[PDB]
Amino acid sequence: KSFLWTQSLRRELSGYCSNIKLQVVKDAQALLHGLDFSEVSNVQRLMRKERRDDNDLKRLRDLNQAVNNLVELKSTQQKSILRVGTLTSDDLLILAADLEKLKSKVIRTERPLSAGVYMGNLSSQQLDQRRALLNMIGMAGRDGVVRVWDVKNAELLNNQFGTMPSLTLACLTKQGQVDLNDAVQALTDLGLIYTAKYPNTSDLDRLTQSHPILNMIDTKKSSLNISGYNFSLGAAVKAGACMLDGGNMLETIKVSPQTMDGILKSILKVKKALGMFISDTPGERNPYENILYKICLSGDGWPYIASRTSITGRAWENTVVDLGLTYSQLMTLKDAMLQLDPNAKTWMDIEGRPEDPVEIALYQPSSGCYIHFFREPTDLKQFKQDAKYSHGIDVTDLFATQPGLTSAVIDALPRNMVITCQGSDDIRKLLESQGRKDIKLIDIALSKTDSRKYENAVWDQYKDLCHMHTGVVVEKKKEEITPHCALMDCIMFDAAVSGGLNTSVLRAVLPRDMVFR
Amino acid sequence: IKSFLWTQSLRRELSGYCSNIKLQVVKDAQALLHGLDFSEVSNVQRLMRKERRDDNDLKRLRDLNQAVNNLVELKSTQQKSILRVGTLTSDDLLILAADLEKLKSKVIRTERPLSAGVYMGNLSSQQLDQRRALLNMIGMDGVVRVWDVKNAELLNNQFGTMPSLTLACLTKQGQVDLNDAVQALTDLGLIYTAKYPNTSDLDRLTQSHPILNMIDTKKSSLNISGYNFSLGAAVKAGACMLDGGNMLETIKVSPQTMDGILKSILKVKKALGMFISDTPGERNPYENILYKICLSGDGWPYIASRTSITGRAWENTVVDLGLTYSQLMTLKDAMLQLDPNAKTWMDIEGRPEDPVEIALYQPSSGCYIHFFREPTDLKQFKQDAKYSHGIDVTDLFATQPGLTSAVIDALPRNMVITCQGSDDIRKLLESQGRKDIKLIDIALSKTDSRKYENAVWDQYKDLCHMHTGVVVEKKEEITPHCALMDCIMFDAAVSGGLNTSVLRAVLPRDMVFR
Amino acid sequence: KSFLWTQSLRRELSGYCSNIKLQVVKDAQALLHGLDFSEVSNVQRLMRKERRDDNDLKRLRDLNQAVNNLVELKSTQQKSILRVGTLTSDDLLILAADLEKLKSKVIRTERPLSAGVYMGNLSSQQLDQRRALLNMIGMDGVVRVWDVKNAELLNNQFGTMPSLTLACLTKQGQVDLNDAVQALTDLGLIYTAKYPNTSDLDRLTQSHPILNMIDTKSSLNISGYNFSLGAAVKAGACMLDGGNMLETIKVSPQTMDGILKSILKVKKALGMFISDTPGERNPYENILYKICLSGDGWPYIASRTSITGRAWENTVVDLGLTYSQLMTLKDAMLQLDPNAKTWMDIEGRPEDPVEIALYQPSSGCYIHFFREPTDLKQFKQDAKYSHGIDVTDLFATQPGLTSAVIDALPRNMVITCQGSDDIRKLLESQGRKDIKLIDIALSKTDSRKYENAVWDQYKDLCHMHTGVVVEKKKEEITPHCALMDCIMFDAAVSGGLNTSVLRAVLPRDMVFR
Numbered sequence A: 001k002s003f004l005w006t007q008s009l010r011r012e013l014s015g016y017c018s019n020i021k022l023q024v025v026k027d028a029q030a031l032l033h034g035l036d037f038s039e040v041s042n043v044q045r046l047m048r049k050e051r052r053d054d055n056d057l058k059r060l061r062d063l064n065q066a067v068n069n070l071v072e073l074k075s076t077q078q079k080s081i082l083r084v085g086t087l088t089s090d091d092l093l094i095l096a097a098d099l100e101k102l103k104s105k106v107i108r109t110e111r112p113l114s115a116g117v118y119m120g121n122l123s124s125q126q127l128d129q130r131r132a133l134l135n136m137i138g139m140a141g142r143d144g145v146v147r148v149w150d151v152k153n154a155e156l157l158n159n160q161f162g163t164m165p166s167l168t169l170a171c172l173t174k175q176g177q178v179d180l181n182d183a184v185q186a187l188t189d190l191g192l193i194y195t196a197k198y199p200n201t202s203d204l205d206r207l208t209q210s211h212p213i214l215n216m217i218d219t220k221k222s223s224l225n226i227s228g229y230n231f232s233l234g235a236a237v238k239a240g241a242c243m244l245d246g247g248n249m250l251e252t253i254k255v256s257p258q259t260m261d262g263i264l265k266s267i268l269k270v271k272k273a274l275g276m277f278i279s280d281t282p283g284e285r286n287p288y289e290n291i292l293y294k295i296c297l298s299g300d301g302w303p304y305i306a307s308r309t310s311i312t313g314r315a316w317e318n319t320v321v322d323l324g325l326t327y328s329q330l331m332t333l334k335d336a337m338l339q340l341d342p343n344a345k346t347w348m349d350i351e352g353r354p355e356d357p358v359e360i361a362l363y364q365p366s367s368g369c370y371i372h373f374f375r376e377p378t379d380l381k382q383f384k385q386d387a388k389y390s391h392g393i394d395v396t397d398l399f400a401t402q403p404g405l406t407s408a409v410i411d412a413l414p415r416n417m418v419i420t421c422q423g424s425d426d427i428r429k430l431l432e433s434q435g436r437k438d439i440k441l442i443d444i445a446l447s448k449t450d451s452r453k454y455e456n457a458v459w460d461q462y463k464d465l466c467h468m469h470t471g472v473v474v475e476k477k478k479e480e481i482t483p484h485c486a487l488m489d490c491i492m493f494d495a496a497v498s499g500g501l502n503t504s505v506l507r508a509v510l511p512r513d514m515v516f517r
Numbered sequence B: 001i002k003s004f005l006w007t008q009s010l011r012r013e014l015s016g017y018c019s020n021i022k023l024q025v026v027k028d029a030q031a032l033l034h035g036l037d038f039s040e041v042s043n044v045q046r047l048m049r050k051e052r053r054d055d056n057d058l059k060r061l062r063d064l065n066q067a068v069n070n071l072v073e074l075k076s077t078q079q080k081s082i083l084r085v086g087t088l089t090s091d092d093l094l095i096l097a098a099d100l101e102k103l104k105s106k107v108i109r110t111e112r113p114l115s116a117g118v119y120m121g122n123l124s125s126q127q128l129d130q131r132r133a134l135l136n137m138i139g140m141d142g143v144v145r146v147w148d149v150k151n152a153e154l155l156n157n158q159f160g161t162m163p164s165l166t167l168a169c170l171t172k173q174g175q176v177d178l179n180d181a182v183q184a185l186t187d188l189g190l191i192y193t194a195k196y197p198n199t200s201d202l203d204r205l206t207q208s209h210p211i212l213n214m215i216d217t218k219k220s221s222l223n224i225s226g227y228n229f230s231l232g233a234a235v236k237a238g239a240c241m242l243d244g245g246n247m248l249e250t251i252k253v254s255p256q257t258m259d260g261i262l263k264s265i266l267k268v269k270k271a272l273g274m275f276i277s278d279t280p281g282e283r284n285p286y287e288n289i290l291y292k293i294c295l296s297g298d299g300w301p302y303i304a305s306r307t308s309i310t311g312r313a314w315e316n317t318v319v320d321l322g323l324t325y326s327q328l329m330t331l332k333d334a335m336l337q338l339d340p341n342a343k344t345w346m347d348i349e350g351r352p353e354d355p356v357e358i359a360l361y362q363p364s365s366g367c368y369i370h371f372f373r374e375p376t377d378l379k380q381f382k383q384d385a386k387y388s389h390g391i392d393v394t395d396l397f398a399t400q401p402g403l404t405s406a407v408i409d410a411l412p413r414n415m416v417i418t419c420q421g422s423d424d425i426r427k428l429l430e431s432q433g434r435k436d437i438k439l440i441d442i443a444l445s446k447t448d449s450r451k452y453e454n455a456v457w458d459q460y461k462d463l464c465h466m467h468t469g470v471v472v473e474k475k476e477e478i479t480p481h482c483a484l485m486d487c488i489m490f491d492a493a494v495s496g497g498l499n500t501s502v503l504r505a506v507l508p509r510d511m512v513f514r
Numbered sequence C: 001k002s003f004l005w006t007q008s009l010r011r012e013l014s015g016y017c018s019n020i021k022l023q024v025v026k027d028a029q030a031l032l033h034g035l036d037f038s039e040v041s042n043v044q045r046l047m048r049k050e051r052r053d054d055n056d057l058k059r060l061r062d063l064n065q066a067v068n069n070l071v072e073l074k075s076t077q078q079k080s081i082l083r084v085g086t087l088t089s090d091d092l093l094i095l096a097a098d099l100e101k102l103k104s105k106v107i108r109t110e111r112p113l114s115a116g117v118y119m120g121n122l123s124s125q126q127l128d129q130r131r132a133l134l135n136m137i138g139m140d141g142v143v144r145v146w147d148v149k150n151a152e153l154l155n156n157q158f159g160t161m162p163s164l165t166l167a168c169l170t171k172q173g174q175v176d177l178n179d180a181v182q183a184l185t186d187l188g189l190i191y192t193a194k195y196p197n198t199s200d201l202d203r204l205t206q207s208h209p210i211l212n213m214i215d216t217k218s219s220l221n222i223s224g225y226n227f228s229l230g231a232a233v234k235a236g237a238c239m240l241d242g243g244n245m246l247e248t249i250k251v252s253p254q255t256m257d258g259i260l261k262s263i264l265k266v267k268k269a270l271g272m273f274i275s276d277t278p279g280e281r282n283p284y285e286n287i288l289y290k291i292c293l294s295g296d297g298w299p300y301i302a303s304r305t306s307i308t309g310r311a312w313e314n315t316v317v318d319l320g321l322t323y324s325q326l327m328t329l330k331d332a333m334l335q336l337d338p339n340a341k342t343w344m345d346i347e348g349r350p351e352d353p354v355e356i357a358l359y360q361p362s363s364g365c366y367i368h369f370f371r372e373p374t375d376l377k378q379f380k381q382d383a384k385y386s387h388g389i390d391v392t393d394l395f396a397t398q399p400g401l402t403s404a405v406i407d408a409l410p411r412n413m414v415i416t417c418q419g420s421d422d423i424r425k426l427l428e429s430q431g432r433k434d435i436k437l438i439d440i441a442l443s444k445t446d447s448r449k450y451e452n453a454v455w456d457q458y459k460d461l462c463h464m465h466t467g468v469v470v471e472k473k474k475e476e477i478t479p480h481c482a483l484m485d486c487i488m489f490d491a492a493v494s495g496g497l498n499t500s501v502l503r504a505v506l507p508r509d510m511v512f513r
Ligand SMILES: Cc1cn([C@H]2C[C@H](O)[C@@H](COP(=O)(O)OP(=O)(O)OP(=O)(O)O)O2)c(=O)[nH]c1=O
Pocket: A109, A110, A113, A148, A157, A159, A160, A161, A162, A163, A164, A223, A224, A225, A226, A227, A234, A235, A238, A285, A290, A304
């Protein structure tokens, strides 16, 4: 049971807990004195939209920044590198495994909000499976892709949605029109129930007769559904936890670079004692997934309750362990593939020979999504020739690429997809070698001159999407020419067929974290 | 804890008998705030602070209880219940009877010493420690007692807690708004859905709910009143504020639902392995619910005013289908009242090898042992009836067997016993293997022996109802000889007079009769 | 820390230390000239076995005997009675309390090697707790190292001795005696200032190749034929000219009280104590064990393999179960399979029992113990018509075991018995209702078919029944023993009686005293 994991974590981590009521209340007073609550109200309106854009994201990020400026309980950017010492060698293997698993769960929980899930012309079963994923993660339109956030840089969504007890307190007070004191009291009572049990709707009902301010709490919302400006029971419980000058609440834990390793060691002791685990399914976190994510985000702050909105990066980026895709990876890849329209015109192109590919790309011009990844060659002799005369890739730059993607991506391609390419024999052979004989191919056969008419235009617009081509490439007359990229080739070949290049933002299908290791 | 597991299982099984009584408890607490003299509440708290209380004190208590009972609608009323086969099986009733007998013994050894008392004077270090241990377990001239009273049965059911009274006292005597106490106790009730609240929980609750600092966590269910603020009292009241959670506290019992409730308790018992402990002191959840329900087939066993209920649980609920181990513990404990060093008379009626009435009397503290035995020699008995005791043999059927051996076994080591016989007493004590007891033969003349005979019967007639037959001497009719009255009159003869004095029965008048 | 305690003991006992290097080398030279080191190799092979039997034990005890025959540094059987004198009355109370605590720690450490611990079908939480204990002490479904008829033959068979360690290194490491001597001397030097650790040993091996024969991973589940760091350090302590090494202490009956008095001065000064943790001995538990084994010998370094008895039996103080005994009892109970068929039977009434037995026939273990009666009048009837126990023979039995054993019985056991009503009441008395009972109800006649075969095999298991017992008809009959009953009631249900070694769950010195 989840509360048992929590109580044992409380028992084990008691020495890292503190009484922070005063500081949370002072932060709440600073917001009350300093924050535009009509702008809070404005951000609540934006979170009620089914579809949000960069203008919506800017409003949220600016408000988060204004909140951050007024409070003292703030997390600071602190990369942590975990080495043998307080943590054992086996401790470190356990932690690196569990963080790989959390990376998978978090990406599959958050990414489709921005990447999107195609929900148009699909079979009954596909629609059912997809709906199940969407429902599980708390998730229109065009076309027919379901996507909550349409933004140029999805990375600007990181860490912008956490609840903070001082904000929750200031907003209950100001937006609910009660005295700060009555707000503190209602939360204290919820805090007290939480010493003994997770509070439920029935418990909260009884509390609302005492404190009508608790009527603002929606018991149907989860942390998947909310921002720091919304009133979930989760937000209220976390605030109430902070009001006790008393009892080992995990929400009051502070981490510093001096206590990180020990706090993690204590978590691993409870992990082994209770058999806690990271789940393979996306959506809501268990107590262990939650504590581990919060601690690893920053070795300097209050993991549960400080303002975390100025923190860049993910927890698996901010805390690293120092001494064929996995199941976790394959699930990420499968769900990322759901963004593709199986019916749409889809280009494919490769660099390297089809029995030895080093760069592969697929491109759907209509929605603008692309698949793009790399493979280390087997035949280094032939690679060197292809490097001089085609692709200009330095082999040593491929060392950091994720192995196994060629198989895995090709296996995950929609059944009966139709692929368009420039030179059909190479593609067929590659697809057949990976066991896909069902994919139909359209060979375009453009002339060499017609093929590269939009070459300069494509590289002018889209250069930032590929940095792999570093070597000078020549052609026999020898003259220097622009290197061939699988991805740019899909885009220029499509532009040549279409008779023009549009200025479109493109959407990467694979996470960068999967393309490279 | 195993105990809270027992409570939670009972809550599940019994949920259909629970009810939403928030509004009634609060309305009752409202009638008390409007109606009750809270200076008298305060007066009764003063009296509960005394180490020694008397009948005047018990008076104030019962009268204030009557005042409380007159103001509230949540009241249990007198309802005797007889359990017969039906909803409860043959096997069920055996279990409940075995369990009530266990509870009875436990409860008496817990409560009776508060008024009967325990001698703590001139005893060995071993005995003093063993007695101190018992005393600590139960909340407590050589005798330590708390209630010095004429009729101790007037203590029954005068000390329960009740949600409405606790709420009304918190409010008035704490000087906070009613809603404030409700709020604080609600919180306490919420915690009690998940655990039994402890001192730590109370500490954290008080920091925001100052009203709770009136609860002193040292005070216990045992030796405290409905007017005092124990954690138990607050927890019970909070249980009533939720209107949910299947709180045992909100159960109502009627003559129609009694057998069904006890059947569900028995179900939980078999499933959890619940039991009545033979240890005195704090009640486990099984012992406690069993007590509370069997007190009345009509009320709210946990939270109603019960102070108008006469009788005890094993008297108001009965199963219709020598000493047991449970009684021998009760017996061995009741005997602790005696001062081994005091002057002690012993007299018997019937010959030494066939006793029918035995008595011992310690004139200094006024306590007495008195019981009966069925004769083996019916021939010699009828002669004894005509010439000595006038006891009708059939009136002895109703007396408890095996007291002769158990009492003589439990008599304190090295006691000096005074008697108008010595020889019949010796033989009998030797018969039971008590050679260590020293005897003083007083050898009074026939006529000096019975100088105070009328005086003694005049004052103490109600203490023995067993002598019914006409007794003659060579013939003229004479006053029958009673073992108890003889001890008293022989003592008066030696003393040169008889004091007007209340005596104390060492044995429960409930162990003498079956 | 333990080295702190060692340092203080060295300061205070220094007058009892002597230089014994010459005698140690002489003994090692006697072994080198006399001992069969192929047989030493054979006993090392036997100690590598995870499970060992009585043939293995005989090999060890015969080799130990051969060693003992060859050396002059040997301890002699010498019982010590401690009386008021050099030790004060309070000294004697401290020492009595400590020997009781040490007895508990020692039994909890060594006894499971032979009694066994059940590690079969149990919860996750039980297996974790039991694994922790087994790891602490250096250790079908029952894990045991020694499967032997008489585990007392294990006593004093595993001590390290400097002459043997020195002889074995020399011969089996194929170096000159002087090379081993100088190597251990250097180790002894380090020991004047610290307990040598792995880095110290690693450093020394680079100048002394012989020292790589030593393992750094203890004194538990090894012998004197093993090359532990402990044995090598002990040998090294003997190689030094002075420096107050506890290893060189000699005790006699004249010095014994004075040595103990001095230890107690250190105990008081440092706050030394006997731990309740099973496993490795701290220096106070160690010196007290070694001194109290014999009042005549070299407690750390002599051959001890001919001494019978334990330290709390060989040294005694003449002046309801303790915490230490309850710890011992809880651990003893780990031997039982909670899932196995288990008989129970009692003599005396359930309210007043005087003999209790439980028996698991598959594994062969039995719980068996006594209690003094409350009602002597009923007891005397039971003595004449059932059990034949003389009440004065119950005086010497350990009280408090009824409550303690029953409270300690595995959760959810199923118990088989002949007549269920008395067992129920007794179990109910200690609030054990989780224990399910099976009433086997054999006829009186079928009951006791195997009565004579059981007594013929197992008489030595109960000596309590001395009274003549009779059955009205009046004729003499065989007294009824709770233990023998479980055994014969089992044989009747099984249709035969196997010849089977039985194992007592409880230590004998827990049943008595
Ligand atoms: C991008 C986005 C995420 N979310 C949700 C999904 C993210 O996984 C989640 C991250 O929240 P945090 O994990 O940032 O929120 P929290 O720390 O308060 O969580 P908890 O209550 O356990 O302490 O926010 C939204 O509700 N709306 C959005 O638009």
